[PDB]
Structure 1
Amino acid sequence: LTLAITTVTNSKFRSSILRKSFDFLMNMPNCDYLTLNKVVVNLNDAGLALQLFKKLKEENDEGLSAQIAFDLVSSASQQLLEILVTELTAQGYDPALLNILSGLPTCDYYNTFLLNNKNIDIGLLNKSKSSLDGKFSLFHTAVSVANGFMHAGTTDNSFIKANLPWLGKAQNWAKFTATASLGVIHKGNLLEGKKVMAPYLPGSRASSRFIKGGSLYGLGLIYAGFGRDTTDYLKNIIVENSGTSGDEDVDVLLHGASLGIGLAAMGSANIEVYEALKEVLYNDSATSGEAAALGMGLCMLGTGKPEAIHDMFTYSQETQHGNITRGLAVGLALINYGRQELADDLITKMLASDESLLRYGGAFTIALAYAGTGNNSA
């Protein structure tokens, strides 16, 4: 497994090698269950993936079937997680192993392990954020985002709740970090994560519509990859505002929605979210127009859609907007992931152009596709 990745160039030849090792390990004579896990993740084959669970039904072990289930959900891509949940249900499953692949105990590992022993060292933390209330949002971001690191996963709102003054000193754009910090702190909550943003959710209004946009972004960090339940929730908000906008803060509400729907659907190809964010790009929005391209690029990860490669690239030359062109440049980098030489057609167009934003995203396009095994050409 290790040598063939850095040696065999053909993807189909190394694909057959992983299939031969599955037959010798199929009988499971107390053999390695981790080797079979790396086979189904690299191949992403629904036939070999569901076949491993069928063997766990014949030989019944609750400790052996668990270690396989918890290992697959962590190492799987977004497309394979749907096979282990949606496709597995149609062909039959294990009621004990279904909740594991859905991420319920997996997200508990992030919440429970970090909550037992957590030392934030509030002594040195207070001196950093008590220095000044000024410096615009540069100071309020540094104290809020760094604080969200220590409490990440433990669901502690003490920065927002227990400390009143640091929240009020923030401006309209500075309240985004204070709200998005809860998405980092409460990350891993598949049930009460919506109750954290409950006062800022749509229909409950807010103190302002600038801070309201940050609530839709906090749902993206917590539910990322599991956000299938929040897919239709975050999509309907964009469709209502997809027509036009009469205010600046309305785009801020859709700004966090585009980044929120992008993280929940991240890695999964969705034509509905792509077409919903495509109409926002037609309006040529200065604020929400950049997040619309970032939300589409996260859905195009992996193979992606070849038609969306030239479509998003054409809109970059037609629409000359600061945030828009830079947002499309990153979106064109995310649409090509692991393609290696298959992305050279888009890389050549960016290197030949003298635009600063096209060359900014052209480097990361090489970084995403040529990652893993090193390439002397890249």
Structure 2
Amino acid sequence: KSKSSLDGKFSLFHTAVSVANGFMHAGTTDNSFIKANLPWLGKAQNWAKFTATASLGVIHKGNLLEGKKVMAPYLPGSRASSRFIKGGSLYGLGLIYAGFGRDTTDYLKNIIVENSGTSGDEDVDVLLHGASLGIGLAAMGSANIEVYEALKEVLYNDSATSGEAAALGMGLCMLGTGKPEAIHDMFTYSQETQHGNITRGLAVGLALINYGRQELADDLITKMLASDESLLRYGGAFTIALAYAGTGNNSAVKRLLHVAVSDSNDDVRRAAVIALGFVLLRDYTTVPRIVQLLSKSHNAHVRCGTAFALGIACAGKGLQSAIDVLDPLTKDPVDFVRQAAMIALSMILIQQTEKLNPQVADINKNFLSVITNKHQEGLAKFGACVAQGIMNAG
């Protein structure tokens, strides 16, 4: 039903189905659907194709036996249609090989140290984008400093496209070290770089690297939120999110309510509300009380952030209090408030029967209605589609 309503030529309408398809078949092989509806897959182009090739690894999470073999045509160096297939192949390889990824790290590194000296055409840029997502995944938690330096050279070599990937790539590799060396370079270089995407990467990156730090992270947070740049404040929010993860905190909440009210730049206003979700997963029945008040706020951004907070927060067993907050928001006219709500609903009510509670059934039906309607705008259509695939985990 999803495939029939939603057309391949549009980049977006292809993305929604593909990620969701992967989710349904996640944790085990099954490309039967992909083969039947192969013409559909091919109509994608640009970054929607990068998604499609990465989606193979979602399906194939786990399986290490056919792990390299199945992605083997698509790997660079071998025939391919386009540059995107080649870039996302390394990205999907890492998903499959994740959590035993020691091997792949060896492979993917060769390509980074290859290209760090100079870079040609666009072909190499999209390759190298894919390469740095790959390494992150393969090396996750390994905190290899020799890898940190390589990545750093991707930023200085300054193909704008690869810059986004390398930034995220660092934080995935280095998680938790709060390595004082790294923190200083990343902060200075965000001012200096002007390309949006590189700055957007490092902002998240400075947050990621201080993980489990807690009270030692105290220093990082103040400076980032104090900056004039909207971008460092966006990363600022999440510095609180990652460092204080997992433990209720009085300090952490207050800073976050204050930011969401006191700052006009709208992206940042959304980012602090998101942040609340992670910190308070310790007593998850406090989340519905905390965001109750903020959901009243008419700033739209604050509202989209409210949904995500509960999504993160109640992700195991469902909580009735949480659902009351999101029922007005499924119905809000603001297009991305609805998208975050529907998405959020599936991550809470993952793996809950439709027989024990009628509300999980109704919520599945609602998603299906949005998808058939063309009266609806595409951003809701994508939100509905992604949600069903989380619920049925394939």
What TM-score does the superposition give when structure 1 sets the normalisation length?
0.64
Q: What secondary structure, in the 3-state scheme, does the structure 2 residue paired with 1:130 have?
A: helix
Deviation at 1:177, TM superposition (A): 1.6
Aligned to 2:220: 346
The answer to whether 1:333 aligns with 2:207 is yes
What TM-score does the superposition give when structure 2 sets the normalisation length?
0.62
Deviation at 1:225, TM superposition (A): 2.6
Aligned to 2:84: 210
Unaligned runs of 5+ in 2: 253-394
The answer to whether 1:268 aligns with 2:142 is yes
Superposed counterparts of 1:44-59, under 5 Å = none
Counterpart CA distance in 2 for 1:212 and 1:134 is 20
The answer to whether 1:180 aligns with 2:50 is no
Aligned to 1:292: 166
- Structure 1 residues 194-224: Cα deviation after superposition (integer angstroms, max 9, x where no partner): 1121101122131112211010000121222
Q: What amino acid is aligned across from residue 219 of structure 2 in structure 1?
A: D
Are the equivalent residues in 2 in contact too, given 1:160–1:178 (CA < 8 A)?
A: no
Q: What amino acid is aligned across from residue 204 of structure 1 in structure 2?
A: S
Alignment RMSD (CA, Å): 1.4
Aligned to 1:194: 68
Q: What amino acid is aligned across from residue 12 of structure 2 in structure 1?
A: L
Aligned to 1:160: 34
Aligned to 2:307: none
Deviation at 1:266, TM superposition (A): 1.2
Change (3 A) 1:227 1:167: same
Q: What amino acid is aligned across from residue 219 of structure 1 in structure 2?
A: L
Unaligned runs of 5+ in 1: 1-126
Counterpart CA distance in 2 for 1:134 and 1:225 is 33
Are the equivalent residues in 2 in contact too, given 1:209–1:249 (CA < 8 A)?
A: yes
Deviation at 1:249, TM superposition (A): 2.8
Counterpart CA distance in 1 for 2:6 and 2:20 is 16
1:257 is aligned, of 131, 134, 144, to 131
Counterpart CA distance in 2 for 1:349 and 1:374 is 23
Deviation at 1:134, TM superposition (A): 5.1
Matched residues, number: 252
Q: What secondary structure, in the 3-state scheme, does the structure 1 residue paired with 2:34 have?
A: coil
Aligned to 2:247: 373
Aligned to 1:42: none
1:224 is aligned, of 88, 98, 104, to 98
- Structure 1 residues 274-308: Cα deviation after superposition (integer angstroms, max 9, x where no partner): 11111100022321111111111112212342211
- Structure 1 residues 30-50: Cα deviation after superposition (integer angstroms, max 9, x where no partner): xxxxxxxxxxxxxxxxxxxxx
Q: Which has the higher contact order (CA 8 A, sep 6+)?
A: 2
Q: Which runs of 4+ in 1 moved over 6 A?
A: none
The answer to whether 1:302 aligns with 2:176 is yes
Q: What amino acid is aligned across from residue 145 of structure 1 in structure 2?
A: V
Counterpart CA distance in 2 for 1:286 and 1:153 is 34
Q: What amino acid is aligned across from residue 17 of structure 2 in structure 1?
A: V
Q: What secondary structure, in the 3-state scheme, does the structure 1 residue paired with 2:204 have?
A: helix
Counterpart CA distance in 2 for 1:270 and 1:301 is 10
The answer to whether 1:139 aligns with 2:19 is no
Q: What secondary structure, in the 3-state scheme, does the structure 2 residue paired with 1:358 have?
A: helix
Q: What secondary structure, in the 3-state scheme, does the structure 1 residue paired with 2:16 have?
A: helix
Counterpart CA distance in 1 for 2:241 and 2:178 is 17
